[PDB]
Amino acid sequence: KETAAAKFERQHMDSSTSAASSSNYCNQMMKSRNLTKDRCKPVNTFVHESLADVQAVCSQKNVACKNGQTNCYQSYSTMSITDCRETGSSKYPNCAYKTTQANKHIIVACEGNPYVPVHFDASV
Ligand SMILES: [Pt+2]
Ligand SMILES: [Pt+2]
């Protein structure tokens, strides 16, 4: 078991480093966070900000989610993130990823009581 919140933190949070450590960051991180378990998760974003900072996005700018739900929120400040994108030659189980660092606003969907991030919707 794992809550939706816990799962967001496993899939999307990496406060430990300020930036995308290396060209190899996604290869290691996607595997270690169990995102390469039953398939190669095609794309995935890691956020290098404190949990509190990311949690607080749930009270920031309310915007439409990509699926049309209304519970998405855009960060008023840009945040340090790393985008992981599966390569063209990547073949499960040896999942291969391109690691791209950026500073962008994040959009998360929040749910629950407490109202916390449960999905990563977009970066802009
Ligand atoms: Pt902006
Ligand atoms: Pt999701």
PDB file of C-alpha atoms and ligand atoms in Angstrom:
ATOM      1  CA  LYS A   1       0.000   0.000   0.000  1.00  0.00           C
ATOM      2  CA  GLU A   2       0.906   3.644  -0.441  1.00  0.00           C
ATOM      3  CA  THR A   3      -1.286   6.767  -0.263  1.00  0.00           C
ATOM      4  CA  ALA A   4      -1.788   8.985  -3.293  1.00  0.00           C
ATOM      5  CA  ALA A   5       0.311  11.633  -1.506  1.00  0.00           C
ATOM      6  CA  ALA A   6       3.127   9.147  -0.722  1.00  0.00           C
ATOM      7  CA  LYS A   7       3.079   8.064  -4.315  1.00  0.00           C
ATOM      8  CA  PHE A   8       3.399  11.663  -5.529  1.00  0.00           C
ATOM      9  CA  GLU A   9       6.442  12.071  -3.255  1.00  0.00           C
ATOM     10  CA  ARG A  10       8.000   8.828  -4.544  1.00  0.00           C
ATOM     11  CA  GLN A  11       7.340   9.716  -8.188  1.00  0.00           C
ATOM     12  CA  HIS A  12       7.964  13.448  -8.115  1.00  0.00           C
ATOM     13  CA  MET A  13       9.941  14.763  -5.161  1.00  0.00           C
ATOM     14  CA  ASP A  14      13.765  14.990  -4.971  1.00  0.00           C
ATOM     15  CA  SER A  15      14.675  17.779  -2.580  1.00  0.00           C
ATOM     16  CA  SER A  16      18.089  16.110  -1.810  1.00  0.00           C
ATOM     17  CA  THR A  17      19.849  17.772  -4.789  1.00  0.00           C
ATOM     18  CA  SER A  18      19.463  21.312  -6.109  1.00  0.00           C
ATOM     19  CA  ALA A  19      19.687  20.369  -9.815  1.00  0.00           C
ATOM     20  CA  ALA A  20      19.885  17.413 -12.243  1.00  0.00           C
ATOM     21  CA  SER A  21      23.020  15.870 -10.804  1.00  0.00           C
ATOM     22  CA  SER A  22      24.219  14.322 -14.085  1.00  0.00           C
ATOM     23  CA  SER A  23      23.530  13.019 -17.586  1.00  0.00           C
ATOM     24  CA  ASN A  24      22.802   9.769 -15.729  1.00  0.00           C
ATOM     25  CA  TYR A  25      20.303  11.144 -13.157  1.00  0.00           C
ATOM     26  CA  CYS A  26      17.081   9.862 -14.819  1.00  0.00           C
ATOM     27  CA  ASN A  27      18.473   6.409 -15.538  1.00  0.00           C
ATOM     28  CA  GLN A  28      19.266   5.935 -11.828  1.00  0.00           C
ATOM     29  CA  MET A  29      16.284   7.862 -10.382  1.00  0.00           C
ATOM     30  CA  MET A  30      13.569   6.340 -12.567  1.00  0.00           C
ATOM     31  CA  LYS A  31      14.828   2.872 -11.531  1.00  0.00           C
ATOM     32  CA  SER A  32      15.356   3.575  -7.835  1.00  0.00           C
ATOM     33  CA  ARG A  33      11.877   5.199  -7.442  1.00  0.00           C
ATOM     34  CA  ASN A  34      10.342   2.117  -9.059  1.00  0.00           C
ATOM     35  CA  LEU A  35       9.180   3.762 -12.201  1.00  0.00           C
ATOM     36  CA  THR A  36      10.744   1.162 -14.451  1.00  0.00           C
ATOM     37  CA  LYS A  37       9.111  -1.837 -12.731  1.00  0.00           C
ATOM     38  CA  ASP A  38       6.287  -3.105 -15.016  1.00  0.00           C
ATOM     39  CA  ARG A  39       7.132  -0.882 -17.994  1.00  0.00           C
ATOM     40  CA  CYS A  40       9.399   2.068 -18.872  1.00  0.00           C
ATOM     41  CA  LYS A  41       7.377   5.009 -17.586  1.00  0.00           C
ATOM     42  CA  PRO A  42       7.573   7.170 -20.708  1.00  0.00           C
ATOM     43  CA  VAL A  43       8.034  10.675 -19.126  1.00  0.00           C
ATOM     44  CA  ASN A  44       8.445  11.796 -15.497  1.00  0.00           C
ATOM     45  CA  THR A  45       9.331  14.998 -13.677  1.00  0.00           C
ATOM     46  CA  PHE A  46      11.336  15.366 -10.401  1.00  0.00           C
ATOM     47  CA  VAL A  47      11.064  18.538  -8.293  1.00  0.00           C
ATOM     48  CA  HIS A  48      14.086  19.881  -6.337  1.00  0.00           C
ATOM     49  CA  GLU A  49      12.371  22.051  -3.844  1.00  0.00           C
ATOM     50  CA  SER A  50      11.321  21.372  -0.298  1.00  0.00           C
ATOM     51  CA  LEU A  51       8.172  19.285   0.363  1.00  0.00           C
ATOM     52  CA  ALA A  52       6.584  22.271   2.121  1.00  0.00           C
ATOM     53  CA  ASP A  53       7.221  24.422  -0.935  1.00  0.00           C
ATOM     54  CA  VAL A  54       5.628  21.912  -3.281  1.00  0.00           C
ATOM     55  CA  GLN A  55       2.709  21.233  -0.893  1.00  0.00           C
ATOM     56  CA  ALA A  56       2.013  24.969  -0.768  1.00  0.00           C
ATOM     57  CA  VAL A  57       1.394  25.002  -4.538  1.00  0.00           C
ATOM     58  CA  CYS A  58      -2.030  23.541  -3.629  1.00  0.00           C
ATOM     59  CA  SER A  59      -3.021  26.989  -2.398  1.00  0.00           C
ATOM     60  CA  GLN A  60      -1.517  28.870  -5.342  1.00  0.00           C
ATOM     61  CA  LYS A  61      -2.900  29.611  -8.828  1.00  0.00           C
ATOM     62  CA  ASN A  62      -5.896  27.450  -9.595  1.00  0.00           C
ATOM     63  CA  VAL A  63      -5.814  26.362 -13.240  1.00  0.00           C
ATOM     64  CA  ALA A  64      -7.527  23.683 -15.372  1.00  0.00           C
ATOM     65  CA  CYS A  65      -5.975  20.258 -15.317  1.00  0.00           C
ATOM     66  CA  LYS A  66      -5.117  18.709 -18.647  1.00  0.00           C
ATOM     67  CA  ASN A  67      -7.875  16.107 -18.157  1.00  0.00           C
ATOM     68  CA  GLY A  68     -10.465  18.846 -17.596  1.00  0.00           C
ATOM     69  CA  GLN A  69     -10.763  18.538 -13.827  1.00  0.00           C
ATOM     70  CA  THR A  70     -10.529  21.794 -11.829  1.00  0.00           C
ATOM     71  CA  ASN A  71      -8.197  20.798  -9.035  1.00  0.00           C
ATOM     72  CA  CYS A  72      -4.854  21.846 -10.595  1.00  0.00           C
ATOM     73  CA  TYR A  73      -2.537  24.511  -9.245  1.00  0.00           C
ATOM     74  CA  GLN A  74       0.300  26.439 -10.820  1.00  0.00           C
ATOM     75  CA  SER A  75       3.360  27.612  -8.750  1.00  0.00           C
ATOM     76  CA  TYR A  76       3.651  31.395  -8.572  1.00  0.00           C
ATOM     77  CA  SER A  77       7.489  31.046  -8.507  1.00  0.00           C
ATOM     78  CA  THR A  78       9.582  28.901 -10.897  1.00  0.00           C
ATOM     79  CA  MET A  79      10.985  25.696  -9.372  1.00  0.00           C
ATOM     80  CA  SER A  80      14.043  23.582 -10.058  1.00  0.00           C
ATOM     81  CA  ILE A  81      12.981  20.378 -11.758  1.00  0.00           C
ATOM     82  CA  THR A  82      14.314  17.597 -13.839  1.00  0.00           C
ATOM     83  CA  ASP A  83      12.430  16.162 -16.763  1.00  0.00           C
ATOM     84  CA  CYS A  84      13.049  12.502 -17.590  1.00  0.00           C
ATOM     85  CA  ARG A  85      12.126  11.396 -21.129  1.00  0.00           C
ATOM     86  CA  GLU A  86      12.541   7.816 -22.352  1.00  0.00           C
ATOM     87  CA  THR A  87      14.951   7.534 -25.333  1.00  0.00           C
ATOM     88  CA  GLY A  88      13.934   6.139 -28.742  1.00  0.00           C
ATOM     89  CA  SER A  89      16.252   3.131 -28.389  1.00  0.00           C
ATOM     90  CA  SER A  90      15.197   2.416 -24.786  1.00  0.00           C
ATOM     91  CA  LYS A  91      13.815  -1.117 -24.408  1.00  0.00           C
ATOM     92  CA  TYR A  92      12.242  -2.535 -21.254  1.00  0.00           C
ATOM     93  CA  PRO A  93      13.681  -3.782 -18.856  1.00  0.00           C
ATOM     94  CA  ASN A  94      16.735  -1.579 -19.561  1.00  0.00           C
ATOM     95  CA  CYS A  95      14.915   1.680 -19.496  1.00  0.00           C
ATOM     96  CA  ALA A  96      16.944   4.613 -20.923  1.00  0.00           C
ATOM     97  CA  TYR A  97      16.179   8.276 -20.236  1.00  0.00           C
ATOM     98  CA  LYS A  98      17.239  11.744 -21.327  1.00  0.00           C
ATOM     99  CA  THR A  99      17.805  14.008 -18.293  1.00  0.00           C
ATOM    100  CA  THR A 100      16.873  17.681 -18.772  1.00  0.00           C
ATOM    101  CA  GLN A 101      17.127  20.287 -16.010  1.00  0.00           C
ATOM    102  CA  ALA A 102      14.911  23.356 -16.130  1.00  0.00           C
ATOM    103  CA  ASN A 103      13.510  26.075 -13.883  1.00  0.00           C
ATOM    104  CA  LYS A 104       9.800  26.339 -14.527  1.00  0.00           C
ATOM    105  CA  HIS A 105       6.448  26.747 -12.888  1.00  0.00           C
ATOM    106  CA  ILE A 106       4.937  23.438 -11.924  1.00  0.00           C
ATOM    107  CA  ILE A 107       1.280  22.418 -12.223  1.00  0.00           C
ATOM    108  CA  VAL A 108       0.045  19.770  -9.755  1.00  0.00           C
ATOM    109  CA  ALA A 109      -3.403  18.301  -8.987  1.00  0.00           C
ATOM    110  CA  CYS A 110      -4.273  18.268  -5.321  1.00  0.00           C
ATOM    111  CA  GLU A 111      -6.841  16.265  -3.387  1.00  0.00           C
ATOM    112  CA  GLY A 112      -7.753  15.214   0.165  1.00  0.00           C
ATOM    113  CA  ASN A 113      -7.715  16.465   3.719  1.00  0.00           C
ATOM    114  CA  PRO A 114      -4.990  17.778   4.096  1.00  0.00           C
ATOM    115  CA  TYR A 115      -5.119  19.079   0.529  1.00  0.00           C
ATOM    116  CA  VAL A 116      -1.853  17.827  -0.974  1.00  0.00           C
ATOM    117  CA  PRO A 117      -0.288  17.052  -4.360  1.00  0.00           C
ATOM    118  CA  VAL A 118      -1.369  13.810  -5.876  1.00  0.00           C
ATOM    119  CA  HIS A 119      -0.317  14.198  -9.537  1.00  0.00           C
ATOM    120  CA  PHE A 120       2.133  16.202 -11.606  1.00  0.00           C
ATOM    121  CA  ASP A 121       0.222  17.691 -14.474  1.00  0.00           C
ATOM    122  CA  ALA A 122       2.630  20.004 -16.342  1.00  0.00           C
ATOM    123  CA  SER A 123       5.453  22.451 -16.193  1.00  0.00           C
ATOM    124  CA  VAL A 124       5.312  25.810 -17.899  1.00  0.00           C
TER     125      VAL A 124
HETATM  126 PT    PT B   1       6.325  33.170 -14.756  1.00  0.00          PT
HETATM  127 PT    PT B   2      -0.283  11.264 -12.712  1.00  0.00          PT
END
